């Protein structure tokens, strides 16, 4: 039923400190309720009830507390938690990080109002994702295969081409159309232009939804931006039955805004000063993906990360890898060598790959070839590390085979260029050609029945 009883408004602001405003004499406070603040100069701001105790409510204000005062500032309480208006009109729109339009179009006519926080899907009703997406990028498709419904973030760093890889994945994804929902947290204007331009250049923009919070926009919008985006993906996937690809741009900007918010409440710190609950918080975003029983649609997530000082042990890539179903790793040392894409396969993973590949799925060799390419690449790295101590004259011919595989793998299998779109079958046969260098008795991940069928070609 509708909220038919009228809203209360209060001038009873008892104190202000950091991002927090504190009202008193509040009639029956509701935890997590939304409050609208009108400042003395007539500026409107919004906040959410972060604590309640008797007659007091504590509000965090999304646009910050600067210029709020104890006497003239006025707060209206909405009677309800944060909900977003959603409709299938939202494809081909641009919004800011709080869901207001920025494309000069109108506000959304809701088909429904949905709770931004979502709601945990029952593990009984989850369907395991098994349909492989071909990205056409060989370093992903052949050695980290993506199932439709996965979470698989791109771990990158400042100055690397993770925008261009994410754009290539959006441009090339298909089964062996996606609707795209794109969120940006803390991006510079040239990053915001790059994506919007690329989606318009590929003609795709009538099938893309963008939420933009730029580097100059309010920080506390960043902690609702991915929840607005994922609520839109959940309507599109689980009510309108679409296949959704969700891109979350720089989760390190989300984590940094979350640290800044939590530091003001003085909640228990974890490693490197992040909130003690950061694992749970990130998990409420990343678990909003997958397939479900009896509905055709699906949500795939590809969050993009910047690793501080390239350190994979930092809490942001660390707690993300603990939740997500793998990672793609973009490497500065490959980027400095002018390779594209810079995907170093060794720190990368896909967990859902193991069941999305093989006989009937892709080809019978795929699970064997992939594991042997990992083994030879790991050994080739170990020989290259030995060479740096002892020099070439110490190496036996068997070491030189792995060190020749290493050079040919990075030029043929990894290196690709920005518009090349390889099949899985091209990726597999480019796999066998590099493996063919080795006498077959060295291929000790591969059983005789696979070798005797595919190596002699």
């Amino acid at each position: 039923n509708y909220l038919s009883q009228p809203r209360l408004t209060y001038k009873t602001v008892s104190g202000v400190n950091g991002p927090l405003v504190i009202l008193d004499h509040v009639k029956f406070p509701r935890y997590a309720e939304i409050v609208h603040l009108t400042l003395p100069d007539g500026t409107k701001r919004s906040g959410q009830v972060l604590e309640v105790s008797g007659s007091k409510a504590v509000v965090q204000v999304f646009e910050g507390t600067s210029g709020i005062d104890a006497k003239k500032t006025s707060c209206e309480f909405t009677g309800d938690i944060l909900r977003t208006p959603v409709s299938e009109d939202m494809l081909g729109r641009v919004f800011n990080g709080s869901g207001k339009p920025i494309d000069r179009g109108p506000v959304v006519l809701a088909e429904d109002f949905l709770d931004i926080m979502g709601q945990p899907i029952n593990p009984q009703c989850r369907i395991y994702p098994e349909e492989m997406i071909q990205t056409g990028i060989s370093a992903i498709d052949g050695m980290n295969s993506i199932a439709r419904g996965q979470k698989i973030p791109i771990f990158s760093a400042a100055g690397l081409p993770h925008n261009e890889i994410a754009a290539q994945i959006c441009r090339q994804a298909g089964l062996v159309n996606f609707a795209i929902v794109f969120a940006a947290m803390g991006v510079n204007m040239e990053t915001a232009r790059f994506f919007k331009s690329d989606f318009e250049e590929n003609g795709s923009m009538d099938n893309v939804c963008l939420f933009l919070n730029l580097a100059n926009d309010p920080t506390i919008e960043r902690i609702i931006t991915p929840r607005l985006a994922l609520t839109t993906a959940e309507f599109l996937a689980y009510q309108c039955e679409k296949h959704v690809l969700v891109i979350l741009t720089d989760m390190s900007s989300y984590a940094e805004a979350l640290r800044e918010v939590s530091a003001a409440r003085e909640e228990v710190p974890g490693r490197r000063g992040f909130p003690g609950y950061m694992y749970t918080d990130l998990a409420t975003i990343y678990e909003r993906a997958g397939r479900v029983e009896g509905r055709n649609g699906s949500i795939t997530q590809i969050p993009i990360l910047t690793m501080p000082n390239d350190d994979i042990t930092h809490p942001i890539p660390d707690l993300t890898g603990y939740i997500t179903e793998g990672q793609i790793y973009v490497d500065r040392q490959l980027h400095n060598r002018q390779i594209y894409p810079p995907i170093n396969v060794l720190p990368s993973l896909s967990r859902l790959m193991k069941s999305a590949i093989g006989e009937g799925m892709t080809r019978k060799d795929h699970a064997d070839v992939s594991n042997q390419l990992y083994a030879c690449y790991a050994i080739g790295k170990d020989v290259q590390a030995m060479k740096a101590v002892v020099g070439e004259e110490a190496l036996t011919s068997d070491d030189l085979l792995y060190l020749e595989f290493l050079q040919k793998f990075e030029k043929n299998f990894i290196t690709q260029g920005p518009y090349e779109n390889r099949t899985v079958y091209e990726t597999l046969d480019i796999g066998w050609q590099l493996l063919r260098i080795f006498p077959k008795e060295m291929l000790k991940r591969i059983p005789q029945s696979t070798l005797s069928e595919f190596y002699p070609r």
Partner: protein, 206 residues
């Protein structure tokens, strides 16, 4: 007029940078070019010879206006800048003119109030954005942004905020991103149709 230092001055549209900022140096202008509306860093350390950047920008660049910011310099290092800058000249319409006809200096020694040391870059960029809005091209130089981040650490330390990374406050990266984001070419507010820009050069001291 009066404007708050921490509020970005509004514009009709914010535009991709295109034209080079000339320094008159062969390296820099050929191998490592900057655009008008660009963002740059230099290593701010003793023997490296920082003054060639500052003097090339001040005397020879295709800037219209120059804003120089000292963030928290040693007493005698600040004195050399304030000695040298008024004595610089350039030639305009076949006549020699002082650099100070197009220049303003923000100056802070390490004993000036810590709130001035932290406000310093926000004063300098707000002064730059005011001449951008007239349809000029402005160059900003910050003498060391490390000396500003130390003032930011002292203020958050005086407030007893949580010490995050290396004692710096949790927002250090958000403040630096929000600062450099004010650089760029723009289509100005208001009726006479015009474009201007602010370019940032900021030294840093690892």
């Amino acid at each position: 007029q009066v404007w708050p230092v921490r509020q970005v001055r509004p514009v009709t549209e914010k535009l991709p940078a295109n034209h080079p900022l000339l320094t008159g140096q062969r390296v820099l202008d050929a191998l490592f070019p900057c655009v008008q509306g660009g963002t740059t860093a230099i290593p701010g350390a003793f023997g490296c010879g920082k003054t060639v950047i500052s003097q090339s920008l001040s005397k020879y660049s295709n800037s219209d206006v120059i804003i120089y910011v000292g963030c928290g310099e040693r007493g005698n290092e600040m004195s050399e800048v304030l000695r040298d800058f008024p004595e610089l000249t350039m030639e305009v319409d076949g006549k020699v003119e002082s650099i100070m006809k197009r220049t303003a200096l923000v100056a802070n020694t390490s004993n000036m109030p810590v709130a001035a040391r932290e406000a310093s870059i926000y004063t300098g960029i707000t002064l730059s954005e005011y001449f951008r809005d007239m349809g000029y091209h402005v160059s900003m130089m910050a003498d060391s942004t490390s000396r500003w981040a130390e003032a930011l650490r002292e203020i958050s330390g005086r407030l007893a905020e949580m010490p995050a990374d290396s004692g710096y406050p949790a927002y250090l990266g958000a403040r630096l991103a929000s600062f450099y984001e004010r650089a760029g070419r723009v289509k100005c507010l208001g009726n006479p149709e015009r474009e201007g820009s602010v370019s940032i050069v900021g030294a840093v001291s690892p």
